[PDB]
Amino acid sequence: KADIAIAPLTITLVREEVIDFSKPFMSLGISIMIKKKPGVFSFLD
Amino acid sequence: KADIAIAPLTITLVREEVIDFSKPFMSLGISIMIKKPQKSKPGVFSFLD
Amino acid sequence: KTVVVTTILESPYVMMKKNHEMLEGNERY
């Protein structure tokens, strides 16, 4: 249905067995995402 | 004179034009190496820090 | 010659333009 993928596609062993990838144009890694000044009279804290 | 290079060889455009590389087995980047400087002494007038 | 290019809307890699309603073809991306 197409001929090329200029996309944020991730390389992996399985997809290479069936299609040909190029040299990576950016490197990355899995990571984890989580939910995230003293007052004027702060000397009383 | 040989057939393979299992070495810390770096990939680049020029070498690919003549030989076939694989997918990188470790990632890296150029970096700078310096003589780690010595630790700091408190200092005169450090009583104001 | 023309290439069939596949993509997905995963910002900031691919995202539609503001008011792309007036854009047609490759310009809407």
UniProtKB/Swiss-Prot annotation, chain A:
Tissue note: Detected in forebrain. Detected in dendrites of neuronal cells. Expressed in the pyramidal cell layers of CA1 and CA3 and in the granule cell layer of the dentate gyrus.
Post-translational modification: Palmitoylated. Depalmitoylated upon L-glutamate stimulation. Ubiquitinated by RNF167, leading to its degradation.
Compartments (UniProt record): Cell membrane; Postsynaptic cell membrane; Postsynaptic density membrane
Residues the record lists as binding L-glutamate: 8, 10, 15
Similarity field: Belongs to the glutamate-gated ion channel (TC 1.A.10.1) family. GRIA2 subfamily.
Recorded domain comment: The M4 transmembrane segment mediates tetramerization and is required for cell surface expression.
Other facts noted in the record for this chain: The postsynaptic actions of L-glutamate are mediated by a variety of receptors that are named according to their selective agonists. This receptor binds AMPA (quisqualate) > L-glutamate > kainate.
Name this protein carries in UniProt: Glutamate receptor 2
Species of origin: Rattus norvegicus
Taxonomic lineage of the native organism: Eukaryota, Metazoa, Chordata, Craniata, Vertebrata
